[PDB]
Amino acid sequence: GSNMSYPPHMQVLLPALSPTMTMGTVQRWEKKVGEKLSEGDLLAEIETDKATIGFEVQEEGYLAKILVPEGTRDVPLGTPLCIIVEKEADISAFADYRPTEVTDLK
Structure with missing residues (x-):
């Protein structure tokens, strides 16, 4: 009874869609290269003056393509x-593979 659906993909862009503004910049979310969270990691806390987006990494955040740090x-x-x-x-x-696939042929 696990619970999975569709592959993950935290768009580098901030998922806001209603920042009440049109010019926000990452405020603070310096993750640790190749990190790894599974209980709510940090989140690109973007802000401008009347709003602030956040990359809430619900249980996740291994820092895969983290190239633009807050700022x-x-x-x-x-x-x-x-x-x-x-x-x-x-x-x-x-480069070698004694076995073939994960299908154990009876």
């Missing part, structure tokens, strides 16, 4: 700064 001014919405996902990380060349 970049693009807008109170589209302002794309980083793509969150909470990746688990996993590297390993492994």
Whole structure:
């Protein structure tokens, strides 16, 4: 009985759609490179003077494409700064493959 639906993809842009303004810049959300949260991580706290967006990373925030740290001014919405996902990380060349797939042929 897990609970999953559609793949994750935190658009670098701030998901506001109603910042009450048209010129907001990331205020504070310096995540830690390759972070990883599963109980509510930080969130791009954007602000302008009468509103502030927030990239609430509900249980997530592995810092995948975090390139624009708080301070970049693009807008109170589209302002794309980083793509969150909470990746688990996993590297390993492994050019050989003794086995084939995960289908254990009876």
